[PDB]
Design a protein around this nucleic acid. Structure first.
Ligand SMILES: [Mg+2]
Ligand SMILES: [Mg+2]
Lengths: 115, 87, 55, 275, 92
RNA sequence: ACUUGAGUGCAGAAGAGGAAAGUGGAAUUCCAUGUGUAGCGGUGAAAUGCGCAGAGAUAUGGAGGAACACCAGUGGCGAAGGCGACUUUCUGGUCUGUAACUGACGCUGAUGUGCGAAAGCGUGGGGAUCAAACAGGAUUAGAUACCCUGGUAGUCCACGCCGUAAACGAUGAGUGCUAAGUGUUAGGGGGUUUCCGCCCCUUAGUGCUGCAGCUAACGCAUUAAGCACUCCGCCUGGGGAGUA
RNA sequence: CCUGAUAUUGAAAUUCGGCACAGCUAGCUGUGUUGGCUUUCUAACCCGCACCACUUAUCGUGGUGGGAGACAGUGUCAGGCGGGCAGUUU
C-alpha cells in the first residue's frame, strides 16, 4: 500500500549503494554492488553500478511504487550512469537531488598524503 | 579615548600663552589626559599589547617636548611639572 | 540603496544554487560597495531574512 | 588566591595556605550557634566504627537555613563569615522582618536577594525558586531532593549542577560527578555556583596541621601480620599474593561495585558515572 | 547614540499576551533617558528557514535613542528567561 | 627674529589592528527506536578489523567540542610575528585637504627594556576531528619506512614561563635626487559632477614591463642592487665548530 | 550478599508464543483453555517525606495532604558464589 517514495543511490569510488525507501526512509529494499557479487576492483567499475540499481527497482515495484525522488553523492563514477537504470527497470524518475555534505569550513581533513 | 568636545577644555586651563592650539604647554597637557586614560584601560585589560606600544610611544614623545622646555624657560618648565604632577 | 539590510534587493541579485554570494566580477559591482553589501547579508541571514542553504 | 610560604624550616618547605580576603566581620552572631561535642567513631555502644578520626580543635556548629522559606521578602546581605564545619563560606542575610539567618554563599554576593516561588523570583545569583520555574542551561546548586525536605545535592566549595531539560513530570539535572538524574519538579534550587573556589590547592605541607583537623594516621595493610589484615606479613616485603587487593574485612576493594537494587533510583538514573 | 533592537517573536502568544511582552520590553528598551525614534512592527511574516521548528513568527522593531552606554544589556538578560522570543539582534 | 622639517587644532573617509562579553548557521563523532538486512570498508592487489548478538545504508532525536564555506581577488591593515562568521562596550596607529598654532622642538641608536610562528614545559579545566609514540595486515630477501582500519602526549581556553626558524624582499634606518608606459585600493583637484559614464590633474601605499647607470654574470632599475650624506650591526680560506 | 518459585496481593488493558487442530487453502484464519513480556490507573503495604494535635519533646502513635506503588520489605522452599569464620586430616 505505497504509491510514491524516494530512491537513494550512493556511489563512492570504492562501492555503490542503492537504498530505495519510503518517504520516512523505511527500507523497502537495498541493492549494493557488493550484493551482486562485485568482490574486487569491480566496485570501481561503472558497469557494476548499472545493474546495482535494478535489483532494488523491481524489489520496490512489488511493494507498489510509481514516482521517486533521487538523492545521490559520490566522488567516484556511477553518479549518473546508475540513475538511468531506474528507467531501464520500469520506474518513473522525475526529480534529481544532489545532496553532498560540503562543510561550512570546519573539522580539518585527514592528512595521510605525504608529498 | 577623549572626545573633541572635551579635548578643548584641556587646553584652556593650561594657557599661559594666548590662543595657541600647539605649544610646549598645551599638547603636553592633552597627552596626560590620555596617559591617565590609556593606563586605566591598562589596569583592567592586560592581554592586549598593541595599545602598550602606543603607550610607550606617546610618553617618549613628551620626554622630548619636556627636554626642549628645560632649555628655553626657567620658570615655565618648572611650572608645568608642578601643575599636573607629571615629572 | 546599498546601505541598509532590511530590503529585498539582497534577495534578487546574489543567489546561484545554495544562496552563495555571487562574485564582484560576474555581477558587476564596485569594490567599496561590496563591503557594505557583504556584512549586511551576514546580518540578513542571522535574522532569517534570507537562507544559508536554500534548496 | 593562595598565599604561599617561604621555606624557613623543613616543615614549611612547600606548605601553601588560603588567603582570607573574602571574610567580613570575623566575630560570629551569638544567637545561632549550637554546641558540637566530638566523637571519633564512637557510636551508641562506645566501640569504634569508622576509623581515622578524633581530636584536633574544638568547633561550634552554626545553624544554616537550607529550607529557604519566607517567600517574597527582600533579604539584604550583611557580612560574609567563616565556617569550619564545611568547605564553603557562609553569609548573614537579614530578612526585612529582622530575622537574621545564614546562607551558604555563592560566588559573588554582597547586594540583596529574594526567595519566592513564582512571583517574578528574579533569576540572579542567590535566589531560590523551584525547578519548574527555572529556564534551561542554568547553573544551580544546593538542590532539594524530596519536596520541602531541605537542600541536599551539591553543597560543597566550588560545586555546581546544571538543568538540562524538562520531562513529563520531573526535570533533568546533570550533577557534578557527571550523572544525569531526574528530580521532582517542585524542588527548590539556589541559582549560581558556590564560592571559595581555590580550595583544593591548599597544600597542607606538614603532618601536624593535617592532624589538628581531626585525622589520625592510616597504617598500610602489608605491614600487619595476618591476624588482622588479609595482606599479612611474610618474610621481608612482599607482593600482595591475592587475585584482588582486599579491604581489612575480606571484601575486594579495587574494582568491584557496591550498590544494591534500590527503590526510586533505577528508573531515574539515566546515565551513570564517568570515572 | 542611535540603536535599533529587533526580535522575532514566536507565534500563538499574541492573541492574549499581546502587549504583555512588547509593552514590557518597550518598557525596558525605552528607559534610562530614551525618547525612542519609532516603535513599530513588520508583522507575522515569513521566515527563510525553521527556527526551533517555527516556520513563521512576529517581527517587532524598536529603534531606541539614548546616551547611556550599556543600559540595554537588561534586554540581553531578559531575552533569556523570556522563552517568548526565538531570535533577536541589536545594531549600532 | 625667520617657517620648508617635526607636533598639535579643525574638515573628512578605509580597514581581517587589538581586548572582554554574548550569538548564529553548516559538516565530524557517540549514545534512543523503527523500516531494514548480508555486507560495510579499504585498496597495485589485498587485508587487519567492525557485522550476522541486526553493522553500514536509512529517518526524526539529543549530547558535546572545534573550525568559521560562498564574499575572498593583485585587495586591506600592523614596526614585525601576524590578523578573514556577526552584534555590542572599551582601545592604538596611519592617510586626504589644509585658513590656524608656539618656532629646529631633529636623524641614528653601544648597554637597557618590551612584544616573539609553531613545537616543548609547569599548575588547573575541557576533550568531537586530525593525530608523533604505540600494537596490528601486507607490500620488502629485510621495513618505525611509503600504503591501510585503530590509537595516547599534543591540538582549544585561562594563568606563568623558554625565546629560536629559509623569523626572507636572503636587500638596516633617515634625507634629497635623476627617460618614460600600463594596472589596481582608499582619498582630493576642471565640468550640466551623465555613478561605477568619462577624460583632465595632483598626492600616498601597491604589482608588472622597460633607458642612462651599476654589476662577475643573472638581474635591479623611483618601492634601485644608480649618483651622494649621517649613524649603527657584521665579515677576512674550507673543515675542526656555533663544538669546548 | 546475589537470583528465581510461591504467600501477604487487587482491577484495567494491549500484544506475543505453547496446547487445543475451532475454518479447511510449510503456512494462513479465528474461537473454547495454558504460560509469559510489557503498559497504565489506586484500595493494601512502604516513606530517616511537609505543617497539625496529644505536649511550651527534631522519640513515638493519631490526623488532610505530597511521593512511590502490587515492585520493594518480610515468611517458607530452592539453586550459586563464600578461608570473612569454624571443625578436623596431612
Ligand atoms: Mg603555542
Ligand atoms: Mg582453618
Amino acid at each position: 500500500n505505497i504509491e510514491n517514495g524516494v530512491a537513494h543511490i550512493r556511489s563512492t569510488f570504492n562501492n555503490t549503494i542503492v537504498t530505495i525507501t519510503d518517504e520516512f526512509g523505511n527500507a523497502l529494499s537495498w541493492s549494493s554492488a557488493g550484493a551482486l557479487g562485485f568482490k574486487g576492483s569491480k566496485k570501481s567499475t561503472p558497469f557494476a553500478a548499472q545493474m546495482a540499481s535494478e535489483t532494488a527497482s523491481k524489489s520496490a515495484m512489488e511493494h507498489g511504487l510509481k514516482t521517486v525522488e533521487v538523492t545521490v553523492k559520490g566522488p567516484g563514477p556511477g553518479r549518473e550512469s546508475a540513475i538511468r537504470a531506474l528507467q531501464s527497470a520500469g520506474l518513473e524518475v522525475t526529480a534529481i537531488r544532489d545532496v553532498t555534505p560540503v562543510p561550512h569550513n570546519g573539522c580539518r581533513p585527514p592528512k595521510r598524503r605525504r608529498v | 579615548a577623549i572626545s573633541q568636545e572635551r579635548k578643548n577644555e584641556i587646553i584652556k586651563e593650561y594657557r599661559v600663552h594666548e590662543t595657541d592650539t600647539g605649544s610646549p604647554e598645551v599638547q603636553i597637557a592633552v597627552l596626560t589626559a590620555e596617559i591617565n586614560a590609556v593606563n586605566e584601560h591598562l589596569r583592567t585589560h592586560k592581554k592586549d599589547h598593541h595599545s602598550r606600544r602606543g603607550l610607550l610611544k606617546m610618553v617618549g614623545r613628551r620626554r622630548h617636548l619636556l627636554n626642549y622646555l628645560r632649555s628655553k624657560d626657567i620658570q615655565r618648565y618648572r611650572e608645568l611639572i608642578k601643575s599636573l604632577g607629571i615629572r | 540603496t546599498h546601505i541598509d539590510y532590511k530590503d529585498t534587493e539582497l534577495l534578487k541579485r546574489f543567489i546561484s544554487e545554495r544562496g552563495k554570494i555571487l562574485p564582484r566580477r560576474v555581477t558587476g559591482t564596485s569594490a567599496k560597495y561590496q563591503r557594505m553589501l557583504t556584512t549586511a547579508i551576514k546580518r540578513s541571514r542571522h535574522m532569517a531574512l534570507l537562507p544559508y542553504v536554500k534548496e | 588566591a593562595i598565599k604561599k610560604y617561604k621555606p624557613i624550616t623543613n616543615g614549611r618547605r612547600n606548605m601553601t595556605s588560603l588567603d582570607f580576603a573574602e571574610i567580613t566581620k570575623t566575630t560570629p552572631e551569638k544567637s545561632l550557634l549550637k554546641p558540637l561535642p566530638k566523637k571519633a567513631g564512637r557510636n551508641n555502644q562506645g566501640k569504634l566504627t569508622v576509623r581515622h578520626h578524633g581530636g584536633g580543635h574544638k568547633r561550634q556548629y552554626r545553624v544554616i537555613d537550607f529550607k529557604r522559606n519566607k517567600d517574597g521578602i527582600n533579604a539584604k546581605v550583611d557580612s560574609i563569615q567563616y565556617d569550619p564545619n564545611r568547605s564553603a563560606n557562609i553569609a548573614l542575610v537579614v530578612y526585612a522582618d529582622g530575622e537574621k539567618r545564614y546562607i551558604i554563599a555563592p560566588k559573588g554576593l554582597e547586594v540583596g536577594q529574594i526567595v519566592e516561588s513564582g512571583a517574578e523570583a528574579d533569576i540572579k545569583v542567590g535566589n531560590a525558586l523551584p525547578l519548574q520555574n527555572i529556564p534551561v542551561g542554568t547553573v544551580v546548586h544546593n538542590i532539594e531532593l524530596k519536596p520541602g525536605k531541605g537542600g541536599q545535592i551539591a553543597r560543597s566549595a566550588g560545586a555546581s549542577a546544571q538543568v538540562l531539560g524538562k520531562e513529563g513530570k520531573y526535570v533533568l539535572i546533570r550533577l557534578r560527578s557527571g550523572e544525569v538524574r531526574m528530580i521532582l519538579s517542585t524542588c527548590r534550587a539556589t541559582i549560581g555556583q558556590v564560592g571559595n573556589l581555590q580550595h583544593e590547592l591548599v597544600n597542607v605541607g606538614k603532618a601536624g596541621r593535617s592532624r589538628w583537623k581531626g585525622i589520625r594516621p592510616t597504617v598500610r595493610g602489608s605491614v600487619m601480620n595476618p591476624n588482622d589484615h588479609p595482606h599479612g606479613g611474610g618474610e621481608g616485603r612482599a607482593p600482595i599474593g591475592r587475585p584482588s587487593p582486599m579491604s581489612p574485612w575480606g571484601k575486594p576493594t579495587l574494582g568491584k561495585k557496591t550498590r544494591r537494587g534500590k527503590k526510586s533510583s533505577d528508573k531515574l538514573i539515566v546515565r551513570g558515572r564517568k570515572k | 547614540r542611535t540603536y535599533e533592537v529587533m526580535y522575532i517573536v514566536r507565534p500563538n502568544i499574541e492573541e492574549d499576551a499581546k502587549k504583555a511582552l512588547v509593552e514590557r520590553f518597550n518598557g525596558i528598551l525605552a528607559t534610562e533617558g530614551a525618547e525612542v525614534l519609532e516603535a513599530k512592527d513588520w508583522g507575522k511574516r515569513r521566515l527563510a528557514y525553521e527556527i526551533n521548528d517555527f516556520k513563521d513568527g512576529f517581527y517587532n522593531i524598536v529603534r531606541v535613542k539614548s546616551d547611556n552606554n550599556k543600559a540595554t544589556d537588561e534586554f540581553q538578560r531578559l531575552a533569556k528567561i523570556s522563552d517568548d522570543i526565538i531570535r533577536y539582534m541589536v545594531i549600532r
